[PDB]
Amino acid sequence: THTALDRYMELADRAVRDPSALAELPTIFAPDATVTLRDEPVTGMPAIMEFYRVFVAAVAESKHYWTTTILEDGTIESHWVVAARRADGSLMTAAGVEHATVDTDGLITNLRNRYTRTPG
Amino acid sequence: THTALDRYMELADRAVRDPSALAELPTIFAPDATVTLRDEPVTGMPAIMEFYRVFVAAVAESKHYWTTTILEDGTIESHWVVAARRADGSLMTAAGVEHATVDTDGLITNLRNRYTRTPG
Ligand SMILES: CC(C)=CCC[C@@]1(C)Oc2ccc(C(=O)O)cc2C[C@@H]1O
Ligand SMILES: CC(C)=CCC[C@@]1(C)Oc2ccc(C(=O)O)cc2C[C@@H]1O
Numbered sequence: 507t508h509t510a511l512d513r514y515m516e517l518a519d520r521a522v523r524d525p526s527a528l529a530e531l532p533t534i535f536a537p538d539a540t541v542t543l544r545d546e547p548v549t550g551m552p553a554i555m556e557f558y559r560v561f562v563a564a565v566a567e568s569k570h571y572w573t574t575t576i577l578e579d580g581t582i583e584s585h586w587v588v589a590a591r592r593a594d595g596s597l598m599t600a601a602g603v604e605h606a607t608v609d610t611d612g613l614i615t616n617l618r619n620r621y622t623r624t625p626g
Numbered sequence: 627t628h629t630a631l632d633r634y635m636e637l638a639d640r641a642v643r644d645p646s647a648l649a650e651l652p653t654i655f656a657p658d659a660t661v662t663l664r665d666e667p668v669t670g671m672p673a674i675m676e677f678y679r680v681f682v683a684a685v686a687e688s689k690h691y692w693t694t695t696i697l698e699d700g701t702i703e704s705h706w707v708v709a710a711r712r713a714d715g716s717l718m719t720a721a722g723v724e725h726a727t728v729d730t731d732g733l734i735t736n737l738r739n740r741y742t743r744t745p746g
Contacts, residue, residue: 569689571711587717589709591691597707599719599743623719623746 507574510534510614511582511606515572521558522565522590528558536609541617566591582606587623600625627694630654630734631702631726635692641678642685642710648678656733663739686711702726702734707743720745 514534521527532551535541540549541557548557568590575583587601601623607616634654641647652671655661660669661677668677688710695703707721721743727736 567691569709571687571709571717573715573717585717587709587719589689589691589707589719595693597691597693597705597721599707599709599721601717601719601746623743626743 509574509576509582509606510608510612511584511604511617512572512574514606514614514617515570515574515584515586518570518588519568522562522568525559525562528555528562531555531558534614535617536611536613536615539613539615539617543617543619544621564593566593566595580608582608598625599623627696629694629696629702629726630728630732631704631724631737632692632694634726634734634737635690635694635704635706638690638708639688641682642688645679645682648675648682651675651678654734655737656729656731656735659733659735659737661737663737664741684713686713686715700728702728718745719743 517527517530531554535554537551539554540547541554548554568588570586570588572584572586577583584604589599591597600621602619602621604617604619606614609615637647637650651674655674657671659674660667661674668674688708690706690708692704692706697703704724706724709719711717720741722739722741724737724739726734729735
């Protein structure tokens with residue numbers, strides 16, 4: 507599928523290679539969207555772009571796999587996995603589920619993640 | 627580095643895409659090598675080829691990252707991570723450390739893995 511959450515997942519690995527790919531974020535998130543990956547919310551495009559710049563700077567190379575469903579209420583859910591080499595040379599894996607609220611244009615207004623395998 | 631263990635790790639993902647890449651295994655393992663990935667040893671080229679054929683059949687797509695060191699005694703050690711989509715559509719991650727004995731030609735005579743993150 508190619509929902510905004512799919513487009514977001516696709517971006518993840520691309521932006522690690524090429525961080526200027528993050529200029530695509532306004533085609534994924536509504537402006538004034540809120541994102542909570544672990545514990546802290548980040549709201550609005552400027553803060554969202556900087557949070558993801560910082561995020562992808564800490565990663566040397568990554569690969570994500572995911573599966574996406576649209577729930578009863580129109581919420582989008584994606585189960586995902588990652589493997590990566592961090593910028594410090596350490597290796598990591600993680601796995602989780604992301605839940606997105608979308609607006610009538612299909613862009614994400616609220617993104618939440620819960621880990622089923624914490625990054626390690 | 628490009629030890630035989632590196633070439634083994636590099637083959638992993640290529641063979642999931644194209645299983646005929648496993649004809650490269652005789653350039654990685656000594657004939658009569660032993661491999662123990664989890665609990666059961668597989669010995670010799672014919673058995674090793676078949677074990678890996680079955681292994682990569684259960685995987686739709688994967689990505690490994692690894693780091694390799696040559697220990698004091700000449701044993702090769704690689705820390706690795708993987709993310710993958712399995713042939714049943716399930717997602718997985720795992721992480722471990724592989725230790726290889728090599729022979730004088732540099733081919734692996736004995737390969738052993740110990741998971742630090744079991745497949746899940
Ligand atoms: C940078 C971007 C556009 C998307 C990130 C996707 C995403 C699934 O990837 C990771 C990777 C590691 C980690 C980690 O915590 O190291 C967390 C996530 C959740 C993110 O939403
Ligand atoms: C097929 C081949 C040539 C190499 C496999 C490498 C390797 C690191 O990859 C996995 C992946 C999953 C798993 C798993 O158990 O699902 C185990 C391993 C150990 C293997 O040695």
